[PDB]
Amino acid sequence: MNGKIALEEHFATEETLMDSAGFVPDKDWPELRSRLLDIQDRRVRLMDEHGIETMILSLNAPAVQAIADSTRANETARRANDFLAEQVAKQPTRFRGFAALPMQDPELAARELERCVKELGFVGALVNGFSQDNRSAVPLYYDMAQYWPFWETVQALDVPFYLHPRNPLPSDARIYDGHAWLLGPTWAFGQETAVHALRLMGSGLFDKYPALKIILGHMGEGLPYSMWRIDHRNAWIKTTPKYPAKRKIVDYFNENFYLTTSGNFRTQTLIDAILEIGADRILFSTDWPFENIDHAADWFENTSISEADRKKIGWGNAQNLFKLNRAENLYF
Amino acid sequence: MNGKIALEEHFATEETLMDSAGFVPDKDWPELRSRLLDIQDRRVRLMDEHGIETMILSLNAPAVQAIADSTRANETARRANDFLAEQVAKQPTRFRGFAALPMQDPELAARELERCVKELGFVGALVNGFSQDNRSAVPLYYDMAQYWPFWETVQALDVPFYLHPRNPLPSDARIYDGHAWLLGPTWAFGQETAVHALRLMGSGLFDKYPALKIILGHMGEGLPYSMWRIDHRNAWIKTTPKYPAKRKIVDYFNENFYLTTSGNFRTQTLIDAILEIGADRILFSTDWPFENIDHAADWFENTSISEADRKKIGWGNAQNLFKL
Numbered sequence: 001m002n003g004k005i006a007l008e009e010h011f012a013t014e015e016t017l018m019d020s021a022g023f024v025p026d027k028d029w030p031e032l033r034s035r036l037l038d039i040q041d042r043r044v045r046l047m048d049e050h051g052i053e054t055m056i057l058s059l060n061a062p063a064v065q066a067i068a069d070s071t072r073a074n075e076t077a078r079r080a081n082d083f084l085a086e087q088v089a090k091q092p093t094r095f096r097g098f099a100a101l102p103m104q105d106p107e108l109a110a111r112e113l114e115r116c117v118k119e120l121g122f123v124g125a126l127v128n129g130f131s132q133d134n135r136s137a138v139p140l141y142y143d144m145a146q147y148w149p150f151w152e153t154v155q156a157l158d159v160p161f162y163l164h165p166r167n168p169l170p171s172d173a174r175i176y177d178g179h180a181w182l183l184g185p186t187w188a189f190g191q192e193t194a195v196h197a198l199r200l201m202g203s204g205l206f207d208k209y210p211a212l213k214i215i216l217g218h219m220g221e222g223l224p225y226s227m228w229r230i231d232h233r234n235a236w237i238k239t240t241p242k243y244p245a246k247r248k249i250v251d252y253f254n255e256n257f258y259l260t261t262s263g264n265f266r267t268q269t270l271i272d273a274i275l276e277i278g279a280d281r282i283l284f285s286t287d288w289p290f291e292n293i294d295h296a297a298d299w300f301e302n303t304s305i306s307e308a309d310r311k312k313i314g315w316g317n318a319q320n321l322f323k324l325n326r327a328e329n330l331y332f
Numbered sequence: 333m334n335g336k337i338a339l340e341e342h343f344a345t346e347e348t349l350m351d352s353a354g355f356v357p358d359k360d361w362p363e364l365r366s367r368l369l370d371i372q373d374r375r376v377r378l379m380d381e382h383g384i385e386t387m388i389l390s391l392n393a394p395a396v397q398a399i400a401d402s403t404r405a406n407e408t409a410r411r412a413n414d415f416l417a418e419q420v421a422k423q424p425t426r427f428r429g430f431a432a433l434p435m436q437d438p439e440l441a442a443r444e445l446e447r448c449v450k451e452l453g454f455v456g457a458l459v460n461g462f463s464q465d466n467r468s469a470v471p472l473y474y475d476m477a478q479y480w481p482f483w484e485t486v487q488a489l490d491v492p493f494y495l496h497p498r499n500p501l502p503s504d505a506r507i508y509d510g511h512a513w514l515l516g517p518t519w520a521f522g523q524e525t526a527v528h529a530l531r532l533m534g535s536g537l538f539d540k541y542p543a544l545k546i547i548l549g550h551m552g553e554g555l556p557y558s559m560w561r562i563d564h565r566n567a568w569i570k571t572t573p574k575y576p577a578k579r580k581i582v583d584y585f586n587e588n589f590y591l592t593t594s595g596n597f598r599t600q601t602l603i604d605a606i607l608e609i610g611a612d613r614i615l616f617s618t619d620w621p622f623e624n625i626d627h628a629a630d631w632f633e634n635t636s637i638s639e640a641d642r643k644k645i646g647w648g649n650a651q652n653l654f655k656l
């Protein structure tokens with residue numbers, strides 16, 4: 001299947017590169033490094049060889065979310081976004097960009113997102129879970145009240161926000177002490193991101209800004225399997241859930257969320273997500289360079305779904321969501 | 333369907349009753365405490381009315397796992413088990429018992445499991461995740477080396493171990509701060525229990541004792557959905573995983589684990605589990621009294637599976653597993 005669109009597709013600057021060291025063995029770092037740093041050459045060749053037309057590119061993790069001085073976070077984000085704009089400009093038929101944002105500061109993040117969308121032509125933002133800010137004794141999650149004006153900006157711009165993983169801070173990771181093998185994509189990434197997404201849904205954010213679009217990778221980080229139980233546990237009790245949101249968690253999931261196939265090339269899992277959130281809200285993605293493009297594409301080529309849904313998940317959903325077949329993207 | 337066996341079926345003694353109070357609104361506590369304390373009467377009438385032949389009974393949560401003094405923990409476990417044996421003896425065709433265990437002290441736990449199985453006729457153990465012990469700076473997980481002689485005893489007795497949930501300790505639960513609605517069965521229970529299971533699998537415990545049988549409630553606490561990813565993330569990297577176990581995590585999941593349907597009455601979830609671990613390793617359970625028996629049975633009656641698998645999940649698999 002030619003013409004696919006992929007949107008969990010990462011790169012690094014020299015400035016952010018070392019954030020990804022640790023996620024593979026030392027013997028494999030030279031390869032990973034080379035993939036992270038390459039946008040124009042081998043990446044596009046692999047795209048051609050595996051039927052990907054468009055990668056929506058994003059900076060690696062945690063990157064800006066781990067820069068605790070918010071003035072410095074803003075500087076790094078601006079440099080990364082300017083670099084990404086230049087790279088997109090070199091092969092504008094094959095690439096679009098997601099914004100890196102200094103979520104340490106709601107005002108700075110909102111201003112940078114405006115600049116990325118209006119001046120740089122980016123199509124959304126990607127953020128690696130919670131932020132570290134020296135001013136806060138605690139990690140910053142985006143349900144907290146100070147973010148609500150930032151979200152108002154996201155909805156006004158009408159671009160999606162990709163809530164990507166990061167690892168929990170060590171003081172929030174004691175269950176994994178001695179079992180470091182569970183950190184990262186094995187498990188801890190998914191728990192961290194699932195809970196952050198649920199915090200957004202419970203907070204009532206989507207009652208106030210109901211047109212927001214949030215994207216989750218990895219088939220939704222376990223959410224579809226357990227979504228029934230989130231709302232329906234202890235169903236004999238007739239009560240009002242003790243969160244500020246007005247409706248069921250599943251309502252916000254169904255209405256405000258999209259899931260990608262990144263790093264979760266498993267047909268059973270895809271089928272469960274289809275039967276829970278529907279194929280209209282599922283997007284192809286690879287997680288290159290942490291996963292192989294050929295692994296992602298070969299799995300998706302043959303996974304057990306209808307040809308109609310293979311086209312929607314492969315490219316139709318993303319083309320519509322990111323308005324890529326519209327005049328502003330094609331001609332301006 | 334009559335003849336079902338259910339095995340996440342809870343009761344409390346007066347000694348452990350109040351552990352359950354925080355899990356329902358104040359207005360529902362009278363109903364809940366009456367369900368927890370009743371074994372012989374309404375509980376059996378509801379089994380009759382909804383086709384359950386046998387409940388395998390277990391003490392409520394966290395119960396013994398929250399009793400920090402291990403001497404006292406062992407005293408509480410013994411009393412609860414003696415009580416449970418007495419209650420089972422009144423209606424022996426309808427009930428069996430799971431042991432409550434003082435997991436704070438591996439020797440005491442092994443001794444109590446032996447007693448419950450050989451002397452009281454119990455058919456396994458049910459433990460509410462990690463233990464708190466005054467003597468330990470950290471919560472106790474059962475992958476830790478001091479529990480291996482305990483697991484040797486479980487395998488020698490050849491009875492299953494039900495790894496049931498509890499909530500994380502507050503210092504290990506900051507991600508849920510200002511979001512207490514996520515604690516308990518909503519989500520925190522499953523995360524805590526999935527990782528405890530995974531810690532067991534990656535520790536190599538099942539290389540050393542391969543006939544161990546571990547049971548998880550709630551359709552396996554999200555494990556089947558993400559199990560491919562657990563082993564196959566970053567697949568282009570060719571390397572030995574950095575855990576002591578010799579094989580893939582999925583190999584231990586498939587070979588040593590069984591899942592129940594407790595509190596997870598969702599057909600899509602069941603089918604995903606069927607297509608990952610197989611219907612021979614799934615078992616009907618309700619989570620009474622925290623879930624209604626009628627909701628559990630009515631869902632299961634009509635869920636979208638073969639009649640052969642409805643019989644196996646309903647009673648066949650549990651009959652084989654517990655040698656009834």
Ligand SMILES: O=[N+]([O-])c1c(O)cccc1O
Binds near residue numbers: 023263287290291566
């Ligand atoms: O998303 N991921 O799962 C992924 C990353 O984006 C960064 C490191 C490892 C990895 O698998």
Ligand SMILES: O=[N+]([O-])c1c(O)cccc1O
Binds near residue numbers: 516595
């Ligand atoms: O298993 N549970 O989810 C369950 C309990 O055993 C204890 C409290 C509430 C509940 O839903």
Ligand SMILES: [Mn+2]
Binds near residue numbers: 008010164217287290
């Ligand atoms: Mn990624």
Ligand SMILES: [Mn+2]
Binds near residue numbers: 340342496549594619
């Ligand atoms: Mn239970």
